[PDB]
Design a protein around this ligand. Structure first.
Ligand SMILES: Nc1nc2c(ncn2[C@@H]2O[C@H](COP(=O)(O)OP(=O)(O)NP(=O)(O)O)[C@@H](O)[C@H]2O)c(=O)[nH]1
Ligand SMILES: [Mg+2]
Length: 160
């Protein structure tokens, strides 16, 4: 079994806790203040004929921890409806690279189901991903869209 520690990072309310709950528990609650009462949730999947245990560590939205220590892959999340969360993506990337290193990382635009209230142009987000040289996914945690693909990509890149 290959165990992979992954950190989910991004500005407040972009959907980090919901993303981890969706992937590891298959739920999306109407909870007001969503919280994961433990350090990480996990999901054990088969990836390219191998047993993989993905351990997903939650973080706070606290820019200067045990979550980052030893991280082996990273999900950078911003929100379709939060302009500042998009503009903060480069800084979150620098924080992970400086504190952990150049680990496999995916850029995620969450809340794509709220596209009517979008404040990020498609060209803007794609151009950012190309500048940072990061795989880019548009996800909806609420509708379970492209969440599985994000973590499967990171697992595969850590293995290969
Ligand atoms: N419409 C929609 N709402 C979403 C989606 N993902 C999360 N949310 C909602 O956005 C809110 C914030 O989500 P949450 O997971 O708490 O975000 P967070 O990044 O963990 N916040 P914090 O940094 O404060 O811990 C919640 O009301 C949650 O239900 C999504 O894909 N679509
Ligand atoms: Mg949270």
């Amino acid at each position: 079994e290959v165990a992979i520690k992954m950190v989910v990072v991004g500005n407040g309310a972009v959907g980090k806790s919901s993303m981890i709950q969706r992937y590891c528990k298959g739920i999306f609650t109407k909870d007001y203040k969503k919280t994961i009462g433990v350090d990480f949730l996990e999901r054990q999947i088969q990836v390219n004929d191998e047993d993989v245990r993905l351990m997903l560590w939650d973080t706070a939205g606290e820019f200067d921890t045990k979550a980052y220590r030893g991280a082996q892959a990273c999900v950078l999340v911003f929100s379709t409806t939060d302009r500042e969360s998009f503009e903060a993506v480069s800084s979150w990337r620098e924080k992970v690279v400086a504190e952990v290193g150049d680990i496999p990382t995916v850029l995620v635009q969450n809340k794509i189901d709220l596209l009517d209230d979008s404040c990020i142009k498609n060209e803007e987000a794609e151009a950012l991903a190309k500048r940072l040289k990061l795989r880019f996914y548009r996800t909806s945690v609420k509708e379970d869209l492209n969440v599985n693909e994000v973590f499967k990509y990171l697992a595969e890149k850590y293995l290969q």
